[PDB]
């Protein structure tokens, strides 16, 4: 119900930084990012069209930290919602509270953000929410609880998020330790490395 195994193995299999470590240290310094995991990982075999589709799907899942059943449901919703399914899918994932908590810079990773949420340290509009998959809406104020404002990991996580590219669709306050989910992110606001149409095709099988 969560992936609790080694993180960099996942990054190595996708062949990209999935941001599953804090990013105080470079990913190449902690692992061989170029090399896929295991004995036969130095080999780079030719990947099928299905394999390209799969590995794109698993990349997005592994970033956000979503198991297949819940991800398939996010796809069904995106297909249902009007407009571009691919863009809708990425919007839903970005909506998730664990993600939003991470992007604001309260958790160092999405897993640390997920723990904060799960451990009743986050409030949405003044009310405690401990569900990682909780969809945050525009004009919602995510905040740290007064008990959790002293947590040393939260102080550290803010300093990391200062290094990263700041989300334009959020607006955080570091002293308050609250932020406003201003709007839903556009497709332009998210990274161009994701080929979401491969996921759309994968599920259209």
């Amino acid at each position: 119900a969560r992936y609790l195994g080694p993180k960099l193995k996942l990054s190595r299999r996708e062949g990209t930084d999935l941001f599953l470590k804090s990013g105080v240290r470079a990913i190449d310094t902690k692992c061989k990012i170029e090399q896929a995991p295991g004995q036969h990982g130095a080999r780079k075999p030719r990947l099928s069209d299905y394999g390209v589709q799969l590995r794109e799907k698993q990349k997005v899942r592994r970033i956000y930290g979503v198991l297949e059943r819940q991800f398939r449901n996010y796809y069904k919703e995106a297909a249902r919602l009007k407009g571009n399914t691919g863009e809708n899918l990425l919007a839903l994932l970005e909506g998730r509270l664990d993600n939003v908590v991470y992007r604001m810079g309260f958790g160092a990773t999405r897993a640390e953000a997920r723990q904060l949420v799960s451990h009743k340290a986050i409030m949405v509009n003044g009310r405690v929410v401990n569900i990682a998959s909780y969809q945050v809406s525009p004009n919602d104020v995510v905040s740290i609880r007064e008990k959790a404002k002293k947590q040393s990991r939260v102080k550290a996580a803010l300093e990391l998020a200062e290094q990263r590219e700041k989300p334009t669709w959020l607006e955080v306050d570091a002293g308050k330790m609250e932020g406003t989910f201003k709007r839903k992110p556009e497709r332009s606001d998210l990274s161009a490395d994701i080929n979401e149409h491969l996921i759309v095709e994968l599920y259209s099988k």
Binding site: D49, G83, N84, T85, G86, H197, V200, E201, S204
Partner: protein, 155 residues
């Protein structure tokens, strides 16, 4: 140009000694903006067969009138036993096509399409039927031209 290998088939001719094996290679190429061509190469080795196919594909490229990364109207293509159907789709549909048709439509620069392949799904004949489909497609402007009307009167 974008280039894609569709199929590689090992073929055989019997001689007095035994069997001379050789390799065929169906490829397609396109600009991803209306132009697409297929090529079929034969050689004693696979890499030579591919390169021959690519060179033939580059020189036998048709033109297709696309409407912003999709078709103008529903089209039916036929070749040999292959019968294909394609129709326009809205943005974010993706290429809903099977195997050989997808390769053609990808490199041709059709992002959104709904397709089905009836009858034989032999890659060689499917690719021809697909490209037969796309070439016989008509834009509003050329329909208006032949009918002696404006685009507004037609549409």
């Amino acid at each position: 140009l974008q280039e894609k290998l569709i199929a590689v088939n090992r073929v055989s001719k019997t001689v007095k000694g035994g069997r001379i094996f050789s390799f065929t290679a169906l490829t397609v190429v396109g600009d991803g903006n209306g132009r697409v061509g297929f090529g079929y190469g034969k050689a004693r080795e696979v890499p030579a067969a591919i390169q021959k196919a690519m060179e033939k594909a580059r020189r036998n490229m048709i033109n297709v009138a696309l409407n912003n990364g999709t078709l103008q109207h529903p089209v039916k293509g036929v070749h040999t036993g292959s019968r294909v159907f394609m129709q326009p789709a809205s943005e974010g549909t993706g290429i809903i096509a099977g195997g050989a048709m997808r390769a053609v439509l990808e490199v041709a620069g059709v992002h959104n399409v709904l397709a089905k392949a009836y009858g034989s799904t032999n890659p060689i004949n499917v690719v021809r039927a697909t490209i037969d489909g796309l070439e016989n497609m008509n834009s509003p402007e050329m329909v208006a031209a032949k009918r002696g009307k404006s685009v507004e009167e037609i549409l």
